[PDB]
Amino acid sequence: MSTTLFKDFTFEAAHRLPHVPEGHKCGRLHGHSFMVRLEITGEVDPHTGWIIDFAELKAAFKPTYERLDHHYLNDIPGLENPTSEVLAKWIWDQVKPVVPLLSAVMVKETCTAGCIYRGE
Amino acid sequence: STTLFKDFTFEAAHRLPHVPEGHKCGRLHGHSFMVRLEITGEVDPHTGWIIDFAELKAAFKPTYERLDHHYLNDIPGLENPTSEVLAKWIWDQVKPVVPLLSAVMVKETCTAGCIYRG
Amino acid sequence: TTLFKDFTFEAAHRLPHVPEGHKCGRLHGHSFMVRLEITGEVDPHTGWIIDFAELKAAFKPTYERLDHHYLNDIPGLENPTSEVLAKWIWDQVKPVVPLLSAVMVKETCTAGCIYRGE
Amino acid sequence: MSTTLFKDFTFEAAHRLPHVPEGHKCGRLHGHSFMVRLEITGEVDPHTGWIIDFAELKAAFKPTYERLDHHYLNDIPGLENPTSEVLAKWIWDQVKPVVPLLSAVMVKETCTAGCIYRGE
Amino acid sequence: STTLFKDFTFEAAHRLPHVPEGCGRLHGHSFMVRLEITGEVDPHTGWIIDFAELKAAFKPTYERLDHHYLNDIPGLENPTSEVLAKWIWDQVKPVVPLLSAVMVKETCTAGCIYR
Amino acid sequence: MMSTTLFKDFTFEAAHRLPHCGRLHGHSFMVRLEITGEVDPHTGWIIDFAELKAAFKPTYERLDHHYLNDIPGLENPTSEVLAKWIWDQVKPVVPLLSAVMVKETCTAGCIYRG
Ligand SMILES: Nc1nc2c(c(=O)[nH]1)N[C@@H](C(=O)O)CN2
Ligand SMILES: Nc1nc2c(c(=O)[nH]1)N[C@@H](C(=O)O)CN2
Ligand SMILES: Nc1nc2c(c(=O)[nH]1)N[C@@H](C(=O)O)CN2
Ligand SMILES: Nc1nc2c(c(=O)[nH]1)N[C@@H](C(=O)O)CN2
Ligand SMILES: Nc1nc2c(c(=O)[nH]1)N[C@@H](C(=O)O)CN2
Ligand SMILES: Nc1nc2c(c(=O)[nH]1)N[C@@H](C(=O)O)CN2
Ligand SMILES: [Zn+2]
Ligand SMILES: [Zn+2]
Ligand SMILES: [Zn+2]
Ligand SMILES: [Zn+2]
Ligand SMILES: [Zn+2]
Ligand SMILES: [Zn+2]
């Protein structure tokens, strides 16, 4: 038995991949509508009937969200190589201290491609 | 090793009774709720499936009819109709008729949801 | 040049003038999607008609009356069909957004209404 | 009575808007997964049973597409103020000559926001 | 103007007869079809017609398209999106006289609008 | 910190029918390829998404705009069979493959793990 909760956010950002070979399109300056899913695993409270309000999860993420949205990721410390993989771990590292029930972070650069980091 | 899922969508009203006064989720409202039933089992060597998708549809239909175009709070067991409670409630209704049931996901909106594994 | 912005709100309604027994007459709800269309001149210097965020800000007061609410309680929405709601929204927004040229309301992902000028 | 045809493309680009008031988030370097819908109108051919092949409409757009995808829009001449409105007309101006049957270009910055240019 | 639309999806096979050696093969799509009606809203009911009625009016035509092979249906021997839109219109127009458009999308990224 | 997964979706337009619903028809089939592995400290990824496209492309082209029932191994082309079929085709080319999901429609699917 287990209960899991998730909430998706989308942020509009620029990035470029600094470690690909000279011809690669992703080494050019570009951007994406990045989707991030924060997944939480925990017990359902008998009174609230939830693990955590989706709104708390939003509120916890907001500070990190706002550093990402409408920004250039390469200028953010720890995102000098802003792959989806690096980004999902970085989001995990920012969010985990405030959301200890965090069990996975998914980031999708496009709606057909994504990465899931679990952390624990 | 092999998992199967089918998605359904229903149109229901609810409100959350145990939230503080200002919270908008305590007001009477509704959603286009989505529910995914996941099944796990061995694939039949002849039919080439665990179970026909139709069967999942037929099995779920009675529970679906209680939820669709209905007010959740009036259904026994759904007096605090969170996504979490609803997913467990759906599991409880469907598990007895679909013993291969391995998970229930409900999404209140396209960006928020709960998965219950039982 | 036509510009648009989509909004989604989670609400309850019931249709009071449907034939007794039809499921739409029972208390229920939807994830409603609304699209506000404006048509007009792109300023040479700004490069837009109006900022997407200005249109959002103009819609916000109306949006808050619809979201996480029961539509029948709102004056003008006692028969809250998709058609009535599209016209209602038009009547609320056209005053604050003069360039408004269409309102689409989607009740579900597959069913909707579009209103302009009757 | 009349028949319209459309084909949808998505590209991943960076941009910023240089004439928005100071502190606007749109004025910071950022990006999107842009969607563009090319709309044509005209007669169906009684033999082929279409106006044109979808693959040929794709092929026509390809040069302009590849200028947009994985690029920074502001470097492109005419996209110095790369709003959806400017972009939509810019795409019209590049694609109309190669596809005279073009009747509308929709560009969406995000899944919930966009512009449709018709020639006015 | 007040307009109403309803979308359906059918799973069917087809091939295009008037193309060279290479989509000319037997294949299929999850076709999306959108029926658009234009009409006056009734003062009492609050609608043009019930969505459920539109579903019922289309149903026979949907049964004819869903889980079928389009080329066998008379009128759809060249089953392009353009021909289909107009053909679906021929079956539905008499049953739904307020019909104003039929959009068919063979993929999520490609389709046709007939008026 | 721990496990990292990568996926990529593909859609192909194909005809099929089941010999055991059984009428001739087709779908816009969706397939997700899932990969698990270590992220390289230099590249910052497991493998490039485009690399995963390239590796799948030969199997893709056999499926896209084709009749599935004529393909060796897909005599009974159920999603279950198709997901497992795809796994067998793709695994040797993509060793880090951890799951294969095929969606017949938007609302129905199967996930396979070899
Ligand atoms: N694995 C992996 N491959 C990628 C990306 C990414 O973030 N991860 N980014 C893609 C892009 O930014 O275009 C290019 N390929
Ligand atoms: N975790 C959790 N938070 C929620 C909900 C819910 O179902 N679960 N429902 C939301 C709502 O009904 O709007 C409010 N917040
Ligand atoms: N035309 C039309 N038909 C409808 C609706 C609606 O709003 N308009 N609402 C639907 C509903 O509320 O479920 C039922 N049928
Ligand atoms: N009308 C209009 N308003 C906009 C944009 C745009 O492209 N058009 N771009 C948005 C952005 O780039 O964030 C901000 N606001
Ligand atoms: N305009 C147009 N182009 C097409 C099609 C179609 O239906 N219309 N059919 C597509 C296909 O069915 O593969 C190929 N190209
Ligand atoms: N389990 C299962 N049931 C199915 C299918 C399928 O692929 N798997 N195929 C569906 C179809 O092709 O219509 C019908 N039912
Ligand atoms: Zn990128
Ligand atoms: Zn709710
Ligand atoms: Zn309703
Ligand atoms: Zn922008
Ligand atoms: Zn085709
Ligand atoms: Zn099928």
Side-chain angles (χ1 to χ4, degrees), chain B residues 50-77:
Chain B
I50 307 176
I51 179 186
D52 193 313
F53 286 134
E55 206 207 297
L56 224 35
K57 269 163 151 282
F60 186 54
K61 188 185 167 57
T63 302
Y64 180 90
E65 298 284 43
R66 297 170 71 190
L67 296 163
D68 186 55
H69 285 80
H70 273 294
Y71 176 47
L72 269 32
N73 297 62
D74 289 350
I75 299 166

mmCIF file of all heavy atoms in Angstrom, chain B residues 50-77:
data_model
loop_
_atom_site.group_PDB
_atom_site.id
_atom_site.type_symbol
_atom_site.label_atom_id
_atom_site.label_comp_id
_atom_site.label_asym_id
_atom_site.label_seq_id
_atom_site.Cartn_x
_atom_site.Cartn_y
_atom_site.Cartn_z
ATOM 1 N N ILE B 50 -3.568 -9.535 -21.124
ATOM 2 C CA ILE B 50 -3.896 -9.909 -19.750
ATOM 3 C C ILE B 50 -5.413 -9.971 -19.656
ATOM 4 O O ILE B 50 -5.988 -10.909 -19.102
ATOM 5 C CB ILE B 50 -3.387 -8.883 -18.712
ATOM 6 C CG1 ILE B 50 -1.892 -8.598 -18.900
ATOM 7 C CG2 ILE B 50 -3.641 -9.391 -17.296
ATOM 8 C CD1 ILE B 50 -1.357 -7.525 -17.980
ATOM 9 N N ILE B 51 -6.042 -8.953 -20.229
ATOM 10 C CA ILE B 51 -7.466 -8.737 -20.119
ATOM 11 C C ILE B 51 -7.853 -7.760 -21.226
ATOM 12 O O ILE B 51 -7.086 -6.849 -21.547
ATOM 13 C CB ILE B 51 -7.804 -8.156 -18.725
ATOM 14 C CG1 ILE B 51 -9.304 -7.893 -18.569
ATOM 15 C CG2 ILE B 51 -7.006 -6.884 -18.461
ATOM 16 C CD1 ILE B 51 -9.651 -7.179 -17.276
ATOM 17 N N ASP B 52 -9.024 -7.961 -21.821
ATOM 18 C CA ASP B 52 -9.538 -7.032 -22.826
ATOM 19 C C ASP B 52 -9.813 -5.669 -22.170
ATOM 20 O O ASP B 52 -10.230 -5.612 -21.017
ATOM 21 C CB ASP B 52 -10.816 -7.600 -23.460
ATOM 22 C CG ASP B 52 -11.244 -6.853 -24.713
ATOM 23 O OD1 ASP B 52 -11.268 -5.606 -24.706
ATOM 24 O OD2 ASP B 52 -11.581 -7.520 -25.710
ATOM 25 N N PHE B 53 -9.575 -4.584 -22.907
ATOM 26 C CA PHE B 53 -9.858 -3.229 -22.419
ATOM 27 C C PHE B 53 -11.340 -3.063 -22.108
ATOM 28 O O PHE B 53 -11.710 -2.401 -21.136
ATOM 29 C CB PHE B 53 -9.466 -2.162 -23.456
ATOM 30 C CG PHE B 53 -7.979 -1.929 -23.588
ATOM 31 C CD1 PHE B 53 -7.392 -1.843 -24.843
ATOM 32 C CD2 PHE B 53 -7.176 -1.730 -22.468
ATOM 33 C CE1 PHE B 53 -6.034 -1.610 -24.981
ATOM 34 C CE2 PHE B 53 -5.820 -1.497 -22.601
ATOM 35 C CZ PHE B 53 -5.248 -1.438 -23.860
ATOM 36 N N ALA B 54 -12.179 -3.656 -22.956
ATOM 37 C CA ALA B 54 -13.625 -3.639 -22.771
ATOM 38 C C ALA B 54 -14.018 -4.085 -21.367
ATOM 39 O O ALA B 54 -14.890 -3.482 -20.745
ATOM 40 C CB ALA B 54 -14.295 -4.523 -23.815
ATOM 41 N N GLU B 55 -13.367 -5.132 -20.866
ATOM 42 C CA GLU B 55 -13.719 -5.688 -19.561
ATOM 43 C C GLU B 55 -13.501 -4.672 -18.452
ATOM 44 O O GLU B 55 -14.318 -4.547 -17.536
ATOM 45 C CB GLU B 55 -12.921 -6.958 -19.263
ATOM 46 C CG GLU B 55 -13.651 -7.883 -18.306
ATOM 47 C CD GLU B 55 -12.720 -8.759 -17.500
ATOM 48 O OE1 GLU B 55 -12.004 -9.584 -18.106
ATOM 49 O OE2 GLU B 55 -12.707 -8.619 -16.259
ATOM 50 N N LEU B 56 -12.391 -3.947 -18.543
ATOM 51 C CA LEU B 56 -12.096 -2.874 -17.610
ATOM 52 C C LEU B 56 -13.217 -1.837 -17.648
ATOM 53 O O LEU B 56 -13.728 -1.422 -16.599
ATOM 54 C CB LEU B 56 -10.744 -2.236 -17.959
ATOM 55 C CG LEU B 56 -9.765 -1.920 -16.829
ATOM 56 C CD1 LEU B 56 -9.812 -2.950 -15.714
ATOM 57 C CD2 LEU B 56 -8.354 -1.818 -17.398
ATOM 58 N N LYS B 57 -13.611 -1.445 -18.860
ATOM 59 C CA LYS B 57 -14.753 -0.545 -19.053
ATOM 60 C C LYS B 57 -16.017 -1.066 -18.359
ATOM 61 O O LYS B 57 -16.620 -0.356 -17.553
ATOM 62 C CB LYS B 57 -15.033 -0.315 -20.547
ATOM 63 C CG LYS B 57 -14.300 0.877 -21.140
ATOM 64 C CD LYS B 57 -14.269 0.823 -22.659
ATOM 65 C CE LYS B 57 -14.216 2.212 -23.282
ATOM 66 N NZ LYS B 57 -15.553 2.878 -23.279
ATOM 67 N N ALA B 58 -16.405 -2.305 -18.667
ATOM 68 C CA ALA B 58 -17.620 -2.899 -18.099
ATOM 69 C C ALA B 58 -17.536 -3.034 -16.579
ATOM 70 O O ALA B 58 -18.496 -2.742 -15.869
ATOM 71 C CB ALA B 58 -17.904 -4.254 -18.738
ATOM 72 N N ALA B 59 -16.380 -3.461 -16.083
ATOM 73 C CA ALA B 59 -16.171 -3.602 -14.648
ATOM 74 C C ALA B 59 -16.326 -2.267 -13.934
ATOM 75 O O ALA B 59 -16.950 -2.187 -12.878
ATOM 76 C CB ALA B 59 -14.797 -4.193 -14.377
ATOM 77 N N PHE B 60 -15.759 -1.217 -14.518
ATOM 78 C CA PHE B 60 -15.768 0.104 -13.896
ATOM 79 C C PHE B 60 -17.116 0.813 -14.016
ATOM 80 O O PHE B 60 -17.453 1.639 -13.179
ATOM 81 C CB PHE B 60 -14.655 0.972 -14.508
ATOM 82 C CG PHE B 60 -14.480 2.303 -13.833
ATOM 83 C CD1 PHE B 60 -14.271 2.380 -12.460
ATOM 84 C CD2 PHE B 60 -14.518 3.482 -14.569
ATOM 85 C CE1 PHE B 60 -14.107 3.609 -11.834
ATOM 86 C CE2 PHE B 60 -14.348 4.710 -13.950
ATOM 87 C CZ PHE B 60 -14.140 4.775 -12.583
ATOM 88 N N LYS B 61 -17.884 0.475 -15.047
ATOM 89 C CA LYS B 61 -19.135 1.174 -15.377
ATOM 90 C C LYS B 61 -20.058 1.487 -14.184
ATOM 91 O O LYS B 61 -20.472 2.634 -14.032
ATOM 92 C CB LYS B 61 -19.901 0.403 -16.461
ATOM 93 C CG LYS B 61 -21.116 1.128 -17.014
ATOM 94 C CD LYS B 61 -21.883 0.242 -17.978
ATOM 95 C CE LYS B 61 -23.254 0.820 -18.290
ATOM 96 N NZ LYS B 61 -23.151 2.199 -18.849
ATOM 97 N N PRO B 62 -20.390 0.481 -13.346
ATOM 98 C CA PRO B 62 -21.244 0.806 -12.197
ATOM 99 C C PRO B 62 -20.680 1.929 -11.310
ATOM 100 O O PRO B 62 -21.401 2.872 -10.983
ATOM 101 C CB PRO B 62 -21.326 -0.519 -11.423
ATOM 102 C CG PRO B 62 -21.047 -1.573 -12.436
ATOM 103 C CD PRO B 62 -20.081 -0.960 -13.406
ATOM 104 N N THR B 63 -19.409 1.838 -10.935
ATOM 105 C CA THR B 63 -18.784 2.902 -10.141
ATOM 106 C C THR B 63 -18.763 4.232 -10.905
ATOM 107 O O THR B 63 -19.014 5.288 -10.320
ATOM 108 C CB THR B 63 -17.352 2.529 -9.705
ATOM 109 O OG1 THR B 63 -17.386 1.313 -8.948
ATOM 110 C CG2 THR B 63 -16.746 3.630 -8.847
ATOM 111 N N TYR B 64 -18.471 4.177 -12.203
ATOM 112 C CA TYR B 64 -18.487 5.375 -13.057
ATOM 113 C C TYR B 64 -19.861 6.055 -13.050
ATOM 114 O O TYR B 64 -19.956 7.276 -12.996
ATOM 115 C CB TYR B 64 -18.091 5.031 -14.504
ATOM 116 C CG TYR B 64 -18.092 6.226 -15.430
ATOM 117 C CD1 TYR B 64 -16.945 6.996 -15.591
ATOM 118 C CD2 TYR B 64 -19.235 6.599 -16.136
ATOM 119 C CE1 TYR B 64 -16.927 8.095 -16.428
ATOM 120 C CE2 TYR B 64 -19.224 7.705 -16.980
ATOM 121 C CZ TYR B 64 -18.060 8.452 -17.113
ATOM 122 O OH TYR B 64 -18.002 9.555 -17.935
ATOM 123 N N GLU B 65 -20.923 5.265 -13.093
ATOM 124 C CA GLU B 65 -22.277 5.829 -13.119
ATOM 125 C C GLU B 65 -22.649 6.545 -11.815
ATOM 126 O O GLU B 65 -23.430 7.497 -11.831
ATOM 127 C CB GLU B 65 -23.300 4.745 -13.448
ATOM 128 C CG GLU B 65 -23.104 4.109 -14.815
ATOM 129 C CD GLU B 65 -23.567 4.987 -15.966
ATOM 130 O OE1 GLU B 65 -23.294 6.205 -15.948
ATOM 131 O OE2 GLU B 65 -24.183 4.445 -16.903
ATOM 132 N N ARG B 66 -22.075 6.099 -10.701
ATOM 133 C CA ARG B 66 -22.271 6.756 -9.409
ATOM 134 C C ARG B 66 -21.509 8.084 -9.303
ATOM 135 O O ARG B 66 -21.919 8.980 -8.563
ATOM 136 C CB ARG B 66 -21.851 5.819 -8.268
ATOM 137 C CG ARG B 66 -22.689 4.549 -8.171
ATOM 138 C CD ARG B 66 -22.078 3.557 -7.191
ATOM 139 N NE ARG B 66 -22.206 4.008 -5.806
ATOM 140 C CZ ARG B 66 -21.611 3.439 -4.759
ATOM 141 N NH1 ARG B 66 -20.826 2.377 -4.910
ATOM 142 N NH2 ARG B 66 -21.807 3.939 -3.545
ATOM 143 N N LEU B 67 -20.408 8.211 -10.045
ATOM 144 C CA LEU B 67 -19.561 9.396 -9.969
ATOM 145 C C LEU B 67 -19.913 10.459 -11.004
ATOM 146 O O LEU B 67 -19.906 11.646 -10.697
ATOM 147 C CB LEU B 67 -18.091 8.996 -10.121
ATOM 148 C CG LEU B 67 -17.545 8.092 -9.010
ATOM 149 C CD1 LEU B 67 -16.256 7.417 -9.436
ATOM 150 C CD2 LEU B 67 -17.337 8.874 -7.721
ATOM 151 N N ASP B 68 -20.226 10.039 -12.226
ATOM 152 C CA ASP B 68 -20.414 10.986 -13.323
ATOM 153 C C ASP B 68 -21.700 11.789 -13.208
ATOM 154 O O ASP B 68 -22.767 11.234 -12.965
ATOM 155 C CB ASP B 68 -20.403 10.277 -14.679
ATOM 156 C CG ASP B 68 -20.460 11.250 -15.826
ATOM 157 O OD1 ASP B 68 -19.596 12.153 -15.889
ATOM 158 O OD2 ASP B 68 -21.385 11.147 -16.647
ATOM 159 N N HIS B 69 -21.586 13.096 -13.424
ATOM 160 C CA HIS B 69 -22.711 14.016 -13.287
ATOM 161 C C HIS B 69 -23.379 13.849 -11.918
ATOM 162 O O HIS B 69 -24.603 13.760 -11.796
ATOM 163 C CB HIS B 69 -23.689 13.852 -14.458
ATOM 164 C CG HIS B 69 -23.189 14.452 -15.737
ATOM 165 N ND1 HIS B 69 -22.280 13.814 -16.553
ATOM 166 C CD2 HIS B 69 -23.447 15.646 -16.323
ATOM 167 C CE1 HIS B 69 -22.014 14.579 -17.596
ATOM 168 N NE2 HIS B 69 -22.705 15.698 -17.478
ATOM 169 N N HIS B 70 -22.539 13.811 -10.891
ATOM 170 C CA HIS B 70 -22.988 13.657 -9.517
ATOM 171 C C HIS B 70 -22.206 14.553 -8.576
ATOM 172 O O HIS B 70 -21.129 15.041 -8.915
ATOM 173 C CB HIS B 70 -22.866 12.199 -9.071
ATOM 174 C CG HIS B 70 -24.060 11.362 -9.413
ATOM 175 N ND1 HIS B 70 -25.302 11.575 -8.852
ATOM 176 C CD2 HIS B 70 -24.201 10.304 -10.246
ATOM 177 C CE1 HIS B 70 -26.157 10.684 -9.324
ATOM 178 N NE2 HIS B 70 -25.513 9.903 -10.175
ATOM 179 N N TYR B 71 -22.782 14.769 -7.400
ATOM 180 C CA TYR B 71 -22.163 15.512 -6.319
ATOM 181 C C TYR B 71 -21.512 14.481 -5.403
ATOM 182 O O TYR B 71 -22.195 13.652 -4.804
ATOM 183 C CB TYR B 71 -23.233 16.324 -5.578
ATOM 184 C CG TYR B 71 -22.752 17.079 -4.355
ATOM 185 C CD1 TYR B 71 -21.587 17.846 -4.387
ATOM 186 C CD2 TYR B 71 -23.486 17.059 -3.172
ATOM 187 C CE1 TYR B 71 -21.155 18.540 -3.269
ATOM 188 C CE2 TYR B 71 -23.061 17.753 -2.049
ATOM 189 C CZ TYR B 71 -21.897 18.497 -2.107
ATOM 190 O OH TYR B 71 -21.475 19.192 -1.006
ATOM 191 N N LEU B 72 -20.189 14.516 -5.304
ATOM 192 C CA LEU B 72 -19.464 13.455 -4.601
ATOM 193 C C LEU B 72 -19.795 13.362 -3.113
ATOM 194 O O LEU B 72 -19.865 12.261 -2.567
ATOM 195 C CB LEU B 72 -17.961 13.616 -4.793
ATOM 196 C CG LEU B 72 -17.316 12.899 -5.995
ATOM 197 C CD1 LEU B 72 -18.227 12.794 -7.189
ATOM 198 C CD2 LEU B 72 -15.999 13.559 -6.366
ATOM 199 N N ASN B 73 -20.016 14.506 -2.469
ATOM 200 C CA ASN B 73 -20.133 14.541 -1.019
ATOM 201 C C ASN B 73 -21.320 13.733 -0.502
ATOM 202 O O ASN B 73 -21.298 13.318 0.645
ATOM 203 C CB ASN B 73 -20.200 15.980 -0.497
ATOM 204 C CG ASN B 73 -18.933 16.770 -0.783
ATOM 205 O OD1 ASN B 73 -18.558 16.977 -1.947
ATOM 206 N ND2 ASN B 73 -18.265 17.219 0.275
ATOM 207 N N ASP B 74 -22.322 13.495 -1.358
ATOM 208 C CA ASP B 74 -23.513 12.705 -0.997
ATOM 209 C C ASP B 74 -23.327 11.193 -1.146
ATOM 210 O O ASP B 74 -24.216 10.440 -0.757
ATOM 211 C CB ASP B 74 -24.724 13.114 -1.848
ATOM 212 C CG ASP B 74 -25.273 14.475 -1.490
ATOM 213 O OD1 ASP B 74 -24.862 15.043 -0.467
ATOM 214 O OD2 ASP B 74 -26.125 14.977 -2.250
ATOM 215 N N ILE B 75 -22.203 10.750 -1.714
ATOM 216 C CA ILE B 75 -21.926 9.316 -1.874
ATOM 217 C C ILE B 75 -21.234 8.794 -0.605
ATOM 218 O O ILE B 75 -20.215 9.338 -0.203
ATOM 219 C CB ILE B 75 -21.031 9.033 -3.109
ATOM 220 C CG1 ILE B 75 -21.720 9.490 -4.403
ATOM 221 C CG2 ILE B 75 -20.703 7.548 -3.200
ATOM 222 C CD1 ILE B 75 -20.797 9.553 -5.613
ATOM 223 N N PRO B 76 -21.792 7.746 0.037
ATOM 224 C CA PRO B 76 -21.173 7.233 1.266
ATOM 225 C C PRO B 76 -19.708 6.857 1.075
ATOM 226 O O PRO B 76 -19.364 6.170 0.111
ATOM 227 C CB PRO B 76 -22.012 5.992 1.595
ATOM 228 C CG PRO B 76 -23.332 6.265 0.975
ATOM 229 C CD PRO B 76 -23.028 7.015 -0.292
ATOM 230 N N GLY B 77 -18.862 7.312 1.994
ATOM 231 C CA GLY B 77 -17.409 7.144 1.881
ATOM 232 C C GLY B 77 -16.682 8.324 1.244
ATOM 233 O O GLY B 77 -15.459 8.431 1.364
#
